[PDB]
Amino acid sequence: MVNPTVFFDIAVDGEPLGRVSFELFADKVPKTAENFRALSTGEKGFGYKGSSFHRIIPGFMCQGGDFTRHNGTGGKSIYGEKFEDENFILKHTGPGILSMANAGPNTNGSQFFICTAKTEWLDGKHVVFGKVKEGMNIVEAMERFGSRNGKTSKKITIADCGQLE
Amino acid sequence: SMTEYKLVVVGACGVGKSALTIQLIQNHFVDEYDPTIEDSYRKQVVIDGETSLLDILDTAGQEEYSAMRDQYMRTGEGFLLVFAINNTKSFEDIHHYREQIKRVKDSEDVPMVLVGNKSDLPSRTVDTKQAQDLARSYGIPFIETSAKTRQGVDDAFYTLVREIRKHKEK
Ligand SMILES: *CCC(=O)N1CC[C@H](C(=O)N(C)[C@H](C(=O)N[C@H]2Cc3cc(O)cc(c3)-c3ccc4c(c3)c(c(-c3cccnc3[C@H](C)OC)n4CC)CC(C)(C)COC(=O)[C@@H]3CCCN(N3)C2=O)C(C)C)C1
Ligand SMILES: Nc1nc2c(ncn2[C@@H]2O[C@H](COP(=O)(O)OP(=O)(O)NP(=O)(O)O)[C@@H](O)[C@H]2O)c(=O)[nH]1
Ligand SMILES: [Cl-]
């Protein structure tokens, strides 16, 4: 019944930066939470490990999760290439919110973003399904490698990831 | 002497705004799609014997950030309205871009060129005549381009520069 928590070991050009952990709201967004959980453990044979935070814009978000094309255009879910927007119960209320990236309605794959501020204009358009538990200071550090067009000044990767007990 | 122009490239996502700009600036093309947030380029060129600095704002094809969009249109001196010849929705969007520019500029006379890109591809869905007729109805130039083969790339940007030059000196 307790929501699962997953961890991301972040690296900068391969050197450890720190750990971010997330609570996944399986209680209210179960299909979307389960996708992220399974992509974090790699149990389906694919997932986040090794992939980059390719788009980081200070004041807004850190976005990642393209493990199929490695170029910001790819990713896939455990349910197929895309899955529908599950619900819009939860909102982009402030720093640390974890939400699905998309290319319009019902196009959730694997890409996701971590808010570094309130992004309320995305409410009702992007499915919020978790939040940072520990390591907001690591997210703030990741944000410093971003820029106005999202390009990062060093390679920010998920060197390891998995599910916590 | 010299002049300088603020050119803005607009159009639906994926139509080739960045590919056209990169061909003009850097003289190469790649198949890989790198979706734009916002990029700016500067290049000195000679057009009809007159040297100019081109400042090119390469915008994202997106319909969610109207305040930013409007500022791009407020500052821009001329606009490339880009669609892809194999993307019917992108052509249907063209009139929205023109309406938005006229709204922001509060004017019916704003330098712009209609660009039908990806002319190399054999998957056309938009007829050349339909684009010609639309541009004629607006009183603006129309050019078909391919960022892949470079057909029409210089002509599209230089035609826009000529539209601005005329507007300024008339
Ligand atoms: C027609 C679009 C389309 O179909 N596409 C297919 C490929 C591509 C695409 O959707 N993907 C690669 C998604 C993806 O990454 N989705 C993104 C949404 C997205 C996608 C793209 O390509 C661009 C933008 C958003 C975009 C473009 C310009 C932006 C912009 C976002 C923001 C701003 C902005 C607004 C106000 C003030 N300042 C700015 C910036 C700083 O000024 C330069 N601009 C300029 C107008 C908003 C943000 C918050 C700053 C950045 O937002 C994002 O990057 C969003 C945040 C939520 C999660 N995102 N990205 C997505 O889901 C892949 C998942 C396949 C296009
Ligand atoms: N065959 C062909 N492909 C093209 C042409 N122009 C662009 N492309 C391809 O179309 C895709 C999208 O091009 P791009 O320039 O990134 O489009 P954009 O309008 O800048 N997209 P965005 O709004 O997301 O920034 C890329 O795969 C690119 O190689 C063209 O003239 N011919
Ligand atoms: Cl967005």
| Domain range summary for chain B, segments of one domain joined by + | 3-169
Q: Which residues of A touch B39 (CB under 8 A)?
A: 149
Cβ contact A72–B35 (<8 Å): yes
Residues B37-40: contacts with CB under 8 Å, at least 24 apart: B37/A55, B37/A57, B37/A148, B37/A149, B37/A150, B38/A148, B38/A149, B39/A149
Please state the atom number of ligand 2 nearest to the C-alpha of residue B36.
Answer: 25
Q: What are the φ and ψ backbone dihedral angles of B95, each rounded to 5 degrees?
A: -60, -30
- For residue A116, the one-letter residue type is T
CA–CA separation, B144 and A111 (whole Å): 35
Query: How many other C-beta atoms can be found within 10 angstroms of the C-beta atom of residue A15?
Result: 8
CA–CA separation, A96 and A130 (whole Å): 9
CB–CB of B112/B35 below 8 Å?
no
CB–CB of B74/B8 below 8 Å?
no
CA–CA separation, A60 and A62 (whole Å): 7
Is the Cβ atom of B60 under 6 angstroms away from ligand 1? yes
Both tokens assigned to B1: 């002497």
Both tokens assigned to A117: 């501020």
Q: Active-site residue A7, yes or no?
A: no
Residue B38 CA: distances (Å) to CA of A134, B14, B66: 32, 14, 14
Angle between helix B128-138 and B94-105 (nearest 10) = 10
CB–CB of B8/B86 below 8 Å?
no
Query: Which residue among the candidates A67, A83, A112, A113 is catalytic per the annotation?
Result: A113
Residue A114 CA: distances (Å) to CA of A59, A93, A95, A118, B158: 11, 11, 8, 11, 42
Both tokens assigned to A107: 């196009």
| CATH classification of the domain holding A130 | 2.40.100.10
Nearest to A25 by CA among A136, A144, A130: A130
Enumerate residues 6+ apart whose C-beta is below 8 A from B38.
A148, A149, B57, B58, B59, B60
CA–CA separation, B64 and B53 (whole Å): 31
CB–CB of B117/B147 below 8 Å?
yes
Domain of A88, in residue numbers: 5-163
What is the count of structural domains for chain A? Answer: 1
Cα-to-centroid distance, A63 and ligand 3 (Å): 11
Query: How many other C-beta atoms can be found within 10 angstroms of the C-beta atom of residue B41?
Result: 16
Residue A104 CA: distances (Å) to CA of A57, A71, A124, B99: 20, 19, 11, 24
Alpha helix positions (H), chain A = 30-41, 136-143
CB–CB of B81/B159 below 8 Å?
no
Both tokens assigned to A52: 């980059």
Token pair 């007159």: residue: B50
Token pair 């660009």: residue: B115
- For residue B23, the one-letter residue type is Q
Cα-to-centroid distance, A126 and ligand 3 (Å): 9
How close B71 gets to chain A, by Cα (Å)? 16
CA–CA separation, A88 and B60 (whole Å): 26
CB–CB of A6/A160 below 8 Å?
no
How close B39 gets to chain A, by Cα (Å)? 7
Residue B131 CA: distances (Å) to CA of A60, A153, B20, B93, B163: 39, 42, 18, 12, 18
Question: How many CB pairs below 8 A link A and B?
Answer: 17
Superfamily of domain B3-169: P-loop containing nucleotide triphosphate hydrolases (3.40.50.300)
Experimentally, the structure was elucidated by X-ray
User: Could you say which of B32, B37, B64 has the minimum Cβ distance to residue A71?
Assistant: B32
CA–CA separation, A28 and A11 (whole Å): 31
Answer whether B32 touches A (CB < 8 Å): yes
Alpha helix positions (H), chain B = 17-26, 66-75, 88-92, 94-105, 128-138, 153-169
CB–CB of A108/A35 below 8 Å?
yes
User: Could you say which of B32, B37, B64 has the minimum Cβ distance to residue A150?
Assistant: B37
Both tokens assigned to A62: 């850190």
